[PDB]
């Protein structure tokens, strides 16, 4: 089966595990249980050409439970950087994660995901992000709570990775 290694990265409590565990058919996890090291989750996406499989390495965001930080990043073919739009601290640390990824993965395609865009008083606005100026980089507003643009990062990455810009998602 056609599959890719995706390293999911971002500050603690930004909603990585919730995101992945939302994609794995389930409720909206209200609890915040910090990830220890990494949790690998297979995500299958049906396309007009067949099923793709993203092996999502959901890594920890907190320094205290990071584990093998860069140790997970090798062999990775793509990545998702996530942060909280209601916490500029998590947005400020994006280029650090970015540099962390780049130092191991030269120039893989990467999507920046501005999570929690359902919460009022958005401190980090979409019209401020200049992260995705480059070709291999993308940005998306997402909501693990309302499933807003939740499939889009994977579609963009899938398009970039397979090489078909007209790739589509189907069901199921």
């Amino acid at each position: 089966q056609v599959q890719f290694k995706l390293v999911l990265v971002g500050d603690g409590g930004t909603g990585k595990t919730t995101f992945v565990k939302r994609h794995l058919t389930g409720e909206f996890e209200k609890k915040y249980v910090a990830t220890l090291g990494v949790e690998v989750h297979p995500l299958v996406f049906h396309t007009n050409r067949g099923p793709i499989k993203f092996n999502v390495w959901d890594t920890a965001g907190q320094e205290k439970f990071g584990g093998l930080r860069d140790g997970y990043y090798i062999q990775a073919q793509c990545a998702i950087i996530m942060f909280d739009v209601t916490s500029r601290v998590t947005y400020k640390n994006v280029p650090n994660w970015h540099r962390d990824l780049v130092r191991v993965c030269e120039n893989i395609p990467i999507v920046l995901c501005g999570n929690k865009v359902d919460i009022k008083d958005r401190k980090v606005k979409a019209k401020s992000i200049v992260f995705h100026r480059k070709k291999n980089l993308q940005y998306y507003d997402i909501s693990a709570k309302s499933n807003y643009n939740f499939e889009k990062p994977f579609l963009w990455l899938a398009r970039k990775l397979i090489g078909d810009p007209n790739l589509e998602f189907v069901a199921m």
């Binding site: 409720e27 990494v38 030269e106 070709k135």
Partner: protein, 902 residues
Amino acid sequence: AKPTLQLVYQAVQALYHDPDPSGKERASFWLGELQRSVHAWEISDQLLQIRQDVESCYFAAQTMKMKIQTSFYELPTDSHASLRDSLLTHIQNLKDLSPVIVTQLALAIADLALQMPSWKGCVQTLVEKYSNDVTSLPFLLEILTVLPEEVHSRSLRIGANRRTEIIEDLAFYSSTVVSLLMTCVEKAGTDEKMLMKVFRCLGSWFNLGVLDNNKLLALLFEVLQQDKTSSNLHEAASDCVCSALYAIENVETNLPLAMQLFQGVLTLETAYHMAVAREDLDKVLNYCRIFTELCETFLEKIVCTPGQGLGDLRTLELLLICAGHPQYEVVEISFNFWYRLGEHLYKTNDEVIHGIFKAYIQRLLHALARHCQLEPDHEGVPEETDDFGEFRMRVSDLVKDLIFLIGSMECFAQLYSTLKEGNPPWEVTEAVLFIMAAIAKSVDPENNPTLVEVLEGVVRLPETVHTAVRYTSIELVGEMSEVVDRNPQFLDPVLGYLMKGLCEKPLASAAAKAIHNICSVCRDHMAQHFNGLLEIARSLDSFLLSPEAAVGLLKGTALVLARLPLDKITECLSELCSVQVMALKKLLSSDPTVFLDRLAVIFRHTNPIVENGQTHPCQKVIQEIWPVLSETLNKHRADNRIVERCCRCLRFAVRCVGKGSAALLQPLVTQMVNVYHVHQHSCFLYLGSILVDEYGMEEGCRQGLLDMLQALCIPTFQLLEQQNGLQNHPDTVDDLFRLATRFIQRSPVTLLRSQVVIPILQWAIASTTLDHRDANCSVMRFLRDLIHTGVANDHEEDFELRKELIGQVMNQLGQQLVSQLLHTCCFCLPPYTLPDVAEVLWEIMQVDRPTFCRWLENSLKGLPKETTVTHKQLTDFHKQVTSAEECKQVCWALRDFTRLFR
């Protein structure tokens, strides 16, 4: 203990190649605690000495780097010398294996260099040792590239002042690095992978630049000037230039440099035109990024001194030349600059400056207007969710902002003028309509003679016209609801145009938004067309909409409904909810969420102005609705989400009717308690808090509500009593204390005199430690209000009772509360709570200050100081807090005291 090497190899292999996620996780944990120990120095060294593959070496190098930064204090001083030599050896042998290993080793060397004072010495020695040898230059440049980056690193473990005095050194070594790089182009230099490294290094060193111009910039721009240049090197150079420009913007910085970068970028116009001519998109993008950086770097000097030095408007000219490129991703960049410019210009109130920039803005909008055009090849409506759609939305936002710097009316007019005299194809028409839709609501009303000419023009355009045009036109019509409102005669023709479009699938979503808006604006004029709105409600499922759109239609319908004569509101609302009711009854026998929400919105936005009777007009519907919701709630009792939506519906219904649901009350409460005992859906606790918000004041309800609370608290406590019962189920905490707060708000005595106040208070104290923000906010708010009710509303009858009741509930658990709060502030939670905790502590003081003093003393007595807080910081804290005459003081004290424990 130390493991065997091949076991480590098993673990690495397993980590990187075991298809089973569990196995990967096991390996990750094992290798996790293989690091973190004392032995992985030796292990990683051994793994580096052996070379079976890239992965073991990578893990080893990464471990080394990780270990010298996660555990440097276990290192005996005199031995350090041997490590530097090791890393220098490894990186000397694993040179041409894989750059990731070299990178990890480079990181290791740098991180080691920064936090050991072998004064200085590392940079100059590394250079003087590895400079002449060319085959070593690649990893030498790597190190030098990563040294400034690791200064502001997260993993590093060093004092705050140390960074500032470390940064002072790199600024010293700057020149030497520049010389090295200038020497690195002499040898080699005819190799792109070398120049790219040179540019990366140069780029990552600009933040420390103090002077020097010289040949490196000239080369940097020459590379960008030449057409022969490859994409990679082009990107490298571009990034370098951008990094320089960005490095400048913060500091003033040094105009002799800025001038050189300015003219430097200015020389690139010809190369840009070349890049465009050959249709080399990469280079065009890079160039646009450079120009955008240039403009955004010198923004203030552009706006404050238009056409002077760094205020040369050739920059905007370059950006507008970029704006002229057919590709959208190109001009997608620089939107931020235009945003910033628009912002600054909004701040400014100057006629000449606006006059100066207005032209550039107009040109921009012209370009962006051209950009929103689809292909003539395009067929079907334009999808909002596609990338080009996103771009179009971004353009819409930007132009929606900027139009104040021109005439909204003027722009709208001259936009409409385009259609009149072309006459354009459908793509242009659609684009113009799209931009007009994004400006319509900003236009001056008294310009209505044009508007009505547009509206009337886009209401009677034929069906045969391209579907995209009709779609966008529908959106436009939707955006002119005010114009429709101020000219009533247009209402019936417009609706007829929207309803038609509602029956066509690919337009249905649009028409749904237009009708919603109108219904919300022409709220009073829609009284005649209500019967039509009901038929739209009966037929909502025939129009294949998104849930949101249908919900929108019903919302509008409700808003219109809320303004009908009082004697008809009941009838209409009844026949309105009847739809959802029948739909729900039908589903047995499958998700009922949609109709639940559809009911919810109706009840949410149906707020008729009524001088209270009794009776409320909407009270004759909850009767007809209750059995269905009850049944629905009983069926899908296990599905938290569906139960949540049902409780939401009930919530809005209650808040809609008000106190007129005393009959609905007891069955609902009974079912709540009955179901909650089986499935602890937190939404039940929230719902419960709303009833309290409506009936807490009513005598005769208080007892039943208390009984409800006591009934709900048992399984709640049982739920939270489990292992990690607070870490999990934080919404339970939140909603529990929401309910408790509402009790404290509407009915303090009833709770204060019950037997659940103490365990709830205990659970609050316990819940203080939870790292979850909504929950914590709820808990702290509850504590605040709970303590506050003992010193609130003295004028009120139950004050004395409440006062001593709180006194009793303070006699116990008070000390505990204070101590727990202090511990939580110091050790558990981040600073965002210190205000909330301060508000609690402040309330405790106003209840009984002299006892609070001793409580705080005792709390401070039992506080661990080590891992050291001194006297006169405990004393000053205690004094600051206890002598405070405002919560802000307590907060500041808490901050000052909290900072000590980091």
